[PDB]
From Swiss-Prot:
This is Exoglucanase 1. Glycans are attached at residues 1, 3, 14. The chain holds residues 478 to 513 of 513 of the full protein. Exocellobiohydrolases (CBH) that catalyzes the hydrolysis of 1,4-beta-D-glucosidic bonds in cellulose to release the disaccharide cellobiose. The degradation of cellulose involves an interplay between different cellulolytic enzymes. Hydrolysis starts with endoglucanases (EGs), which cut internal beta-1,4-glucosidic bonds in cellulose to reduce the polymerization degree of the substrate and create new chain ends for exocellobiohydrolases (CBHs). The CBHs release the disaccharide cellobiose from the non-reducing end of the cellulose polymer chain. Belongs to the glycosyl hydrolase 7 (cellulase C) family.
Length: 36
């Protein structure tokens, strides 16, 4: 599960795309999305 302040991933991310329960995957950049 993607951790708080972890990259849930933007375009081309093949890792943990699901954020921790209570955190939301927020796109900060097209490729950088973070779980806040």
């Amino acid at each position: 599960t993607q951790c708080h302040y972890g990259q849930c991933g933007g375009i081309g991310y093949s890792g943990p795309t699901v954020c921790a329960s209570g955190t939301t995957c927020q796109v900060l950049n097209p490729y950088y999305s973070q779980c806040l």
